[PDB]
Ligand SMILES: CCn1cc(Cl)c2c(C(=O)C3=C(O)[C@@H]4CC[C@@H](C4)C3=O)ccnc21
Ligand SMILES: CCn1cc(Cl)c2c(C(=O)C3=C(O)[C@@H]4CC[C@@H](C4)C3=O)ccnc21
Ligand SMILES: [Co+2]
């Protein structure tokens with residue numbers, strides 16, 4: 001059931017903003033590791049004396065990397081005279097976030113019809129305000145409310161090129177890398193208590209409900225904005241990875257970003273070639289028994305050659321009533337065992353493809369446990 | 378003249394330590410951009426609950442990248458029970474350094490005969506202590522004194538593998554990258570006042586003296602440890618780049634690291650191929666007039682084909698009474714216009730090669746000014 005209860009008009013995920021200590025080095029590592037192009041910048045070279053922000057893109061996926069300059073460079077400014085291109089940015093908030101959490105997502109940004117209206121309706125319905133609506137160059141409106149922990153949900157609306165004040169990147173610095181990633185599929189939060197988190201977020205958005213953890217997924221009307229949230233389950237044999245996250249992150253935050261690929265075989269071939277030369281590492285692949293069991297689960301969807309290619313690349317597969325899901329997880333993106341990335345591709349639910357086609361892979365918890373036991377043999 | 382006045386036995390540069398917000402992303406970017414192998418680690422996986430430290434190597438060059446974990450992970454520890462592998466590390470100092478300066482060098486480390494003796498003699502001769510000598514696993518001794526700004530000179534001595542507590546890196550994570558870089562040639566500081574800086578450092582080491590700036594170079598007895606120091610010169614037409622450094626760095630710090638290559642043509646070919654895919658950018662190349670003028674300056678040292686290869690790669694050349702110097706400079710390594718890297722290779726002074734052979738390129742200030750004026754034509 002989908003009661004289509006959004007309290008404002010939501011379109012799609014727009015961008016993800018990482019708060020960094022050095023945006024340059026993180027952005028360059030991510031660009032090479034994920035195959036994303038440098039697309040826009042706002043920094044000293046564009047007149048921004050407050051923060052350095054670099055935008056990477058792959059298809060519709062937009063990753064923004066932001067770090068503060070010395071406050072001394074902008075000491076004479078006030079908010080009405082700021083050279084910051086992102087008006088919600090604050091030196092103290094950014095440094096506090098990074099000191100507390102390390103590298104991680106500060107903002108999950110969605111495009112809405114009217115960010116001013118979205119902000120008002122959200123706060124009227126219980127959202128904790130983080131940054132009020134601000135109109136940039138009479139063209140783009142941005143506002144922010146608290147999502148969980150120190151992560152904000154950022155609303156963006158356009159009257160009619162990322163943000164005013166950002167410059168397109170000189171072609172020579174913009175190498176057209178592309179490993180197949182096309183859009184953000186979902187963004188997952190870890191919280192200490194799932195119940196209150198769900199009630200809060202569903203409360204102010206109207207989003208409906210779509211081992212070691214309990215989870216639920218909030219979704220927009222067309223189920224294209226997908227926001228899973230996890231809480232830990234305590235006392236288990238193996239310690240809850242959600243609890244490990246909360247300890248190393250100093251509390252709630254964004255756990256993983258799932259990036260849809262138009263060709264997950266090519267994406268993973270490209271990413272795995274670069275794992276040891278500056279890119280991202282992947283979690284340990286499942287045993288050969290997992291892929292032998294795949295024939296009985298998805299042999300109608302995937303040929304044996306395609307199943308063999310899943311095995312070459314360490315890809316997991318899950319299936320539900322309506323669609324099939326190919327997925328794989330990176331090791332953590334930075335020093336702490338906190339945020340990681342999922343690469344995903346969905347098969348089915350063709351109407352365009354409906355959002356969440358095939359679910360989120362929860363069947364792979366049991367299929368992996370059983371496959372490792374099967375594999376001790 | 379070289380009075381060989383070192384107050385203790387100094388061997389060579391040992392390593393450079395960057396203090397980072399996220400060591401993983403900086404280390405991976407540097408590894409790919411410079412062709413350095415991941416060689417050792419000390420982090421959560423090795424039992425270090427305090428800091429994440431990753432060691433990159435290329436030949437004898439050792440780059441260490443360190444970032445703090447949440448203090449909560451080690452809250453129960455005291456110094457006698459610490460799991461830190463680098464005992465001088467402090468969460469507050471590291472966060473304060475990075476907040477103030479951004480990404481940069483915290484420690485210039487030299488190998489000495491006895492780091493305990495070097496520390497005592499240094500402080501007896503005016504050095505400001507930063508971390509007292511500490512013996513690690515009865516095998517390695519480390520001590521630190523202030524060099525300039527928040528940069529420390531770190532003494533390391535070995536009784537008889539980087540540091541105890543570091544583990545060698547799993548071969549699969551250690552891709553054998555190598556673009557030809559072999560050792561640190563010199564490490565350069567920017568200070569507000571050159572005179573007092575020189576007197577202080579030469580005071581406690583016994584090191585002897587080897588537009589927009591004044592400079593002098595301190596050197597060890599065999600002139601293999603080379604420490605240039607710059608101060609700004611004010612009022613000029615173009616603003617002093619040393620002054621720009623001090624403003625954006627919030628004071629004195631390390632300006633550039635010069636990395637010797639055994640084949641600067643290959644190093645620069647390799648680095649330039651990666652500039653736009655996660656590596657390092659280079660400063661604008663000199664005009665064609667610079668390379669036409671090179672025939673008259675170094676035509677006895679470099680064939681026209683070799684001079685043409687310098688032009689392809691943007692390489693600068695300078696010469697003194699005893700040797701020839703090939704050099705090139707990167708753009709700044711991170712967000713702020715502060716630290717950068719020089720790639721260098723020296724021709725001549727064969728006895729092994731004597732240190733500083735060919736100087737440091739100061740002749741290229743005038744040769745570049747004149748070549749740009751020549752090139753307006
Ligand atoms: C193989 C072990 N494994 C590790 C992960 Cl992270 C994972 C996921 C995954 O991506 C997550 C989500 O998108 C949904 C929100 C939380 C739940 C579901 C969840 O865990 C699905 C199945 N098995 C998984
Ligand atoms: C082409 C413009 N240019 C930019 C740099 Cl950074 C540079 C250097 C260089 O590396 C530096 C040093 O190693 C020595 C210590 C300070 C002096 C000398 C100095 O500037 C030499 C010649 N020309 C240069
Ligand atoms: Co997921």
Ligand SMILES: [Co+2]
Pocket residue numbers: 563565633635719737
């Ligand atoms: Co130099």
